[PDB]
């Protein structure tokens, strides 16, 4: 994460982005705000005092190299919690019926479903569709080879969810498809 922030995986020029607000120009709309800015707005609005935020916020890197907590509503681009893999896991030691609430609060506190972020990660679906237009299994294999390479790049969580929820990509990764 040398040039990448934890909450939303955008490319920066714990590093966190500007959150749609340059420096600290105040009187900003609390709907374009994400990451740290909307977190501070939430803190001010709901009068929360404990600012540790460790235990109710799960970020992609600290998780055991897993991203199955998150779905991907492709109609809007929202990252949404998954009933499966959240009702079957516990984090830091808790009942298994609270990981869902941890994920939901993390989405709500950080506000990762901003229209800006949704319309941004919506374009990765377009780019992945354009490769699967000529129906050439070599270019799609190449797309997966570049998207599942080291040094995680811009939006490297949806870049993995998209490959997850596919039958050609998963089959080609497994071995049942040979190009």
Partner 1 sequence: NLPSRITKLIKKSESGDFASSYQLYKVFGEPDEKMSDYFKELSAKQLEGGQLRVADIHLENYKGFESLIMDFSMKKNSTILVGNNGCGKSTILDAIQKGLTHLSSRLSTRSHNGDGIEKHELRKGQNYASIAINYDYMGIRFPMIIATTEPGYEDRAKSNYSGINELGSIFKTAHSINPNVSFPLIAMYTVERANDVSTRDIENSEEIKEAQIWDKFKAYNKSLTGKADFKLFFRWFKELIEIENVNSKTLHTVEDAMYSFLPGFSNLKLQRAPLDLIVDKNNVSLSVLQLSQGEKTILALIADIARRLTLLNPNSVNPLDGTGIVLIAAIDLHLHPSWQQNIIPRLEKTFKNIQFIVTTHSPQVCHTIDSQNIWLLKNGQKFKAPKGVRGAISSWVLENLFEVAQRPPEDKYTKLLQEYKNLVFSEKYASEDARKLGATLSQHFGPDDETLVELKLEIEKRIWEDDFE
Interacting residues with partner 1 (CB under 8 A)? 8, 10-13, 17-18, 20-22, 25-29, 32, 74-75, 115-117, 119-120, 123-127, 129-130, 132-133, 135, 142, 146, 153-154, 166-168, 171, 177
Query: Whole-number minimum distance, CB 119 to partner 1, in Å?
Result: 6
Q: Which does 2 bind (CB under 5 to 8 A by kind): partner 1, Zn ion, none?
A: none
SS3 115: helix
Q: Which does 35 bind (CB under 5 to 8 A by kind): Zn ion, partner 1, none?
A: Zn ion
Write the burial class of residue 152 (CB in 10 Å: 0-12 exposed, 13-18 middle, 19+ buried).
middle
Query: Whole-number minimum distance, CB 10 to Zn ion, in Å?
Result: 5
Tokens of 97: 């019926």
Write out the residues near Zn ion by the rule CB under 5 A: 5, 8, 17, 35
Any idea how long the chain is? 179
Nearer to Zn ion, 38 or 172 (CB): 38
Query: Whole-number minimum distance, CB 75 to partner 1, in Å?
Result: 5
Nearer to partner 1, 103 or 112 (CB): 112
Question: Can you tell me the distance from the alpha carbon of 68 to that of 62, in angstroms, rounded to the nearest whole number?
Answer: 14
Nearer to partner 1, 19 or 91 (CB): 19
Question: Can you tell me the distance from the alpha carbon of 67 to that of 69, in angstroms, rounded to the nearest whole number?
Answer: 5
Tokens of 86: 């959240």
Residue 124 CB partners (closer than 8 Å, separation 6+): 155, 158, 159, 162
CB-CB contact of 41 with 29 (8 Å) = no
Nearer to partner 1, 104 or 146 (CB): 146
Query: Whole-number minimum distance, CB 128 to Zn ion, in Å?
Result: 22
């Amino acid at each position: 994460q040398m040039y990448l922030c934890a909450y939303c995986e955008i490319d920066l020029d714990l590093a966190v982005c500007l959150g749609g607000t340059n420096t600290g120009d105040d009187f900003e709309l609390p709907a374009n705000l994400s990451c740290d800015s909307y977190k501070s707005h939430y803190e001010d609005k709901n009068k929360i005092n404990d600012k540790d935020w460790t235990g109710k916020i799960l970020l992609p890197l600290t998780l055991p190299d897993a991203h199955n907590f998150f779905t991907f509503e492709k109609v809007t681009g929202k990252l949404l919690p998954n009933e499966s893999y959240c009702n079957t896991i516990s984090i830091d030691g808790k009942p298994a019926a609270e990981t869902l609430s941890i994920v939901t609060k993390t989405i709500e506190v950080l506000n990762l479903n901003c229209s800006r972020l949704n319309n941004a990660r919506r374009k990765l679906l377009f780019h992945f569709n354009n490769c699967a237009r000529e129906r050439n299994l070599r270019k799609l294999h190449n797309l997966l080879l570049q998207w599942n390479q080291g040094e995680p790049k811009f939006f490297q969580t949806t870049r993995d969810i998209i490959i997850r929820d596919d039958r050609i990509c998963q089959g080609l990764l497994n071995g049942t498809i040979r190009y």
